[PDB]
Design a binder for this molecule. Structure first.
Ligand SMILES: CCCCCCCCCCC(CCCCCCCCCC)(CO[C@H]1O[C@@H](CO)[C@H](O[C@@H]2O[C@@H](CO)[C@H](O)[C@@H](O)[C@@H]2O)[C@@H](O)[C@@H]1O)CO[C@H]1O[C@@H](CO)[C@H](O[C@@H]2O[C@@H](CO)[C@H](O)[C@@H](O)[C@@H]2O)[C@@H](O)[C@H]1O
Ligand SMILES: CCCCCCCCCCC(CCCCCCCCCC)(CO[C@H]1O[C@@H](CO)[C@H](O[C@@H]2O[C@@H](CO)[C@H](O)[C@@H](O)[C@@H]2O)[C@@H](O)[C@@H]1O)CO[C@H]1O[C@@H](CO)[C@H](O[C@@H]2O[C@@H](CO)[C@H](O)[C@@H](O)[C@@H]2O)[C@@H](O)[C@H]1O
Ligand SMILES: CCCCCCCCCCCCCCCC(=O)OC[C@H](COP(=O)(O)OCCN)OC(=O)CCCCCCCCCCCCCCC
Lengths: 288, 116, 288, 116
């Protein structure tokens, strides 16, 4: 009743979008601007509705000249279900839009060609919003699928590599085969810029993940996953294998001999609080 | 037949990594909550000020040092500084955190140099 | 040369260019806009890159609505060699663009229409930015040729006179043949405005040249050219006939008979430092 | 022929006559080199600080004299002001230069009145 009020009064629009909309209204293209604006707005509110329901921390709902964004501040902060319930809510409003359209136009309220154009643009947007490329929407689903069976670093590297190869394939197809189609060049440029920006910060995500892992107190304890490493492995290397939403007991191996199991919280507290880092498991075995 | 009539467009979520700075009023409430005993307040306080780690670490680059150790010591210094910060004197927390992290990285660099 | 990168990231754009792009995006003229923008950007980048080599005070490279502009800071205070080198940075640049277009057409990346369009636009801009007008590279070549055997002031006067005559000829031709094609009219207005500006700034340009000459550092000392003058004029009227990049041993004629030989240094120092700017030249033989 | 379908574009270098005023750091280093002693620093400073002559001459119209002599007096007064500049007076360099230019123009006006 009050939470959504700021979301309503927080819409920002790029000035270039204003210029494009005014010129399109001027030069005939009126039946097309409304359809695209309505589709984009509906999709953005679909993204935001689940985010605000989970009591997330949104910033702004922008409207780029080539799409829309809903900036949030949760990366590696919430479990798989919380992110999935927001990501899937994007490519799930077009279904009810199509259901409304196929009944509104069939009862012959407006016209046929308008329905044809609406369906064309709607389906085109839906199938463009699922390319397995970061960030889009399919790429994040692929990242979630990887993260559930792989260590976080491994998932964040394989997803990055797959997005890179798909981006190069798309760029080759756009530049060398298809005619000009400026809407494809801008897509390629945006994808490359976003991917490079994500690569440039491949390090803070891990530390944010570990920091959030430190301060979980009875956060709905879940499956216990035995983990075993050798004795001379460094502390950072053994901490690198921490998959999301799993508590990992550590078993040390002193070249065939195991001393005792160590709790994950113990090792992580030794990392942060006691500052007993840059050492192997032997140092943590015998304290001060 | 179909190409040259598609409007591609995008609709993504843009997961950021640098939270916005905290206001000048909620800081006192967060500090009081931490004083009475809380941990989510500590998380929110040490996550909102992460850009300082980047700011100082960028200055110390081009010295033949990996980013992993630099960021680790930076976060350790920030948590140490916030863990022992006193508001009785009166000073912007950003300067205190910056001095703490700079001192921590300088101490680590001096220790590493002495090791060699 | 990281100043190249600084300039390329410091490229301003006029607000009207966004409106032009918006009008060209809803109508279908992206190919022409891209070709023209590419040609103009290559021209400007070549000019700026070759200007940085000689360490000039380049301000910024910006794209005004009807072309481009490099804001070179040094006007008439340099040897003509580097000026003539930098001005030819663009007429000697379209050659490799044409070669690249030929190669791309032969490999069949682009079909057999865009190649002709690009060649037509390239060979039109090359022949437009060469007319004997000031500005445009025609003036910055004809004037440099003029300043090789003539005094600087006379060269500038004759250059502006010829530029005005040719601008009037072009305006008459446009009015007689094409009463349309707004591009010609805006080009004419630009030419007239710039001609007025460099007509109004002539005094300061000349004073800058003279002051730079006085504070010389023996920049590639060339042969010495004498100057025989009668002792009945004003000193500002004898310093006017100064060539470019030449030291002049001043020869004075007293009632038709040679009296003494004086270097430019002492007379110019007496004119500036000694404040004898409006007295005479005859008493400079025996200042004390 | 092809004249009907043509586009005219311009790509030229515009040579400014009055360079923009320079900030404190570079003028400070130029004055430091001035103290060391160099004519090129004098040339650069007078070149960068020539706009004041234009302002003074523009506001000193309605006099009935020529322009070349006024510009020459302005620039010679500017040179006299820069060579006599001191950082201990306690005022901006631009104001001192403007005062010197006005003084020189007034001196020329008095001389012309005496001659006439
Ligand atoms: C967040 C909101 C953003 C909204 C943006 C503006 C919204 C308007 C979109 C504008 C736009 C797409 C451009 C998208 C680029 C934007 C990408 C942004 C990137 C930023 C960097 C949609 O325009 C559509 O509007 C429809 C409404 O009428 C019409 O199609 C409907 O379909 C029927 C069913 O099959 C329906 O029955 C019927 O009703 C309609 O016929 C057409 O007008 C068109 O399909 C216009 O595209 C343009 O493409 C080019 C060549 O294709 C065209 O150029 C020329 O065409 C010939 C005629 O001059 C010329 O001979 C030729 O020389 C030249 O080729 C243009 O003419 C125009 O077509
Ligand atoms: C930073 C760079 C900024 C550059 C600006 C834009 C650059 C883009 C050029 C834009 C522009 C030149 C005008 C330049 C004026 C700009 C002056 C700037 C002053 C700023 C203040 C394109 O000119 C060329 O574009 C090419 C694009 O394809 C086309 O050539 C072809 O390309 C290939 C395909 O066949 C082939 O291979 C190739 O063989 C072809 O030749 C043709 O359109 C044309 O040759 C505008 O077109 C102009 O011509 C016609 C339309 O045809 C319009 O006539 C109108 O017709 C009715 C229909 O409305 C109207 O009822 C009527 O009223 C009006 O008569 C004009 O009015 C105007 O629209
Ligand atoms: C910095 C720019 C590169 C150097 C400049 C050299 C001049 C380029 C000459 C090529 C023809 C003119 C192209 C003008 C635009 C155009 O008209 O593109 C029109 C053509 C359309 O092809 P089609 O419809 O005929 O295909 C028919 C299919 N059946 O798309 C292209 O070919 C674009 C590909 C070549 C452009 C250079 C690619 C550079 C790759 C590296 C990127 C580096 C930065 C590039 C910044 C854009």
């Amino acid at each position: 009743m009050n939470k959504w009020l700021d979301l309503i009064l927080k819409i920002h629009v790029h000035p270039f979008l204003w210029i494009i909309a005014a010129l399109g209204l001027l030069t005939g293209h009126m039946k097309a601007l409304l359809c695209l604006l309505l589709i984009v707005l509906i999709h953005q509110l679909g993204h935001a509705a689940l985010a605000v329901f989970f009591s997330w921390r949104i910033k702004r709902v922008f409207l780029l000249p080539f799409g829309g964004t809903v900036e949030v501040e949760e990366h590696g902060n919430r479990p798989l279900k919380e992110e999935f319930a927001v990501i899937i809510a994007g490519p799930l409003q077009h279904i009810w839009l199509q259901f409304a359209a196929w009944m509104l136009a069939e009862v012959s309220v407006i016209h046929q060609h308008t329905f044809e154009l609406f369906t064309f643009y709607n389906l085109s947007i839906l199938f463009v919003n699922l390319l397995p490329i970061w960030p889009l929407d399919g790429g994040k689903l692929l990242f979630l699928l990887f993260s559930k069976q792989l260590p976080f670093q491994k998932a964040h590297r394989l997803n990055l590599k797959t997005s890179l190869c798909f981006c190069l394939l798309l760029g080759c197809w756009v530049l060398f085969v298809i005619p000009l189609q400026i809407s494809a060049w801008v897509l390629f440029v945006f994808l490359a810029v976003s991917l490079f920006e994500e690569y440039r910060q491949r390090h803070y995500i891990h530390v944010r993940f570990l920091l959030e892992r430190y301060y979980g107190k009875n956060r709905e304890l879940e499956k216990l996953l035995p983990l075993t490493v050798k004795a001379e492995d460094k502390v950072y290397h053994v901490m690198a294998e921490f998959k999301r939403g799993c508590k990992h007991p550590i078993i040390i191996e002193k070249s065939g001999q195991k001393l005792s199991q160590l709790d994950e919280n113990e090792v992580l507290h030794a990392y942060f609080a006691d500052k007993r880092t840059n050492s192997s498991m032997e140092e943590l075995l015998l304290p001060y | 037949f179909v190409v040259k009539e598609l409007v591609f467009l995008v609709s993504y979520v843009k997961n950021n990594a640098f939270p916005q700075p905290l206001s000048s009023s909620e800081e006192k409430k967060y500090l009081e909550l931490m004083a009475k005993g809380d941990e989510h307040a500590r998380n929110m306080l040490i996550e909102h000020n992460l850009r300082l780690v980047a700011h100082i670490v960028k200055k110390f680059e081009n010295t033949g040092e990996d980013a992993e150790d630099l960021i680790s010591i930076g976060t350790i210094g920030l948590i140490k500084g916030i863990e022992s910060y006193s508001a009785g004197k009166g000073t912007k927390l950003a300067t205190y955190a910056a001095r703490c992290i700079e001192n921590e990285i300088l101490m680590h660099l001096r220790a590493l140099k002495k090791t060699k």
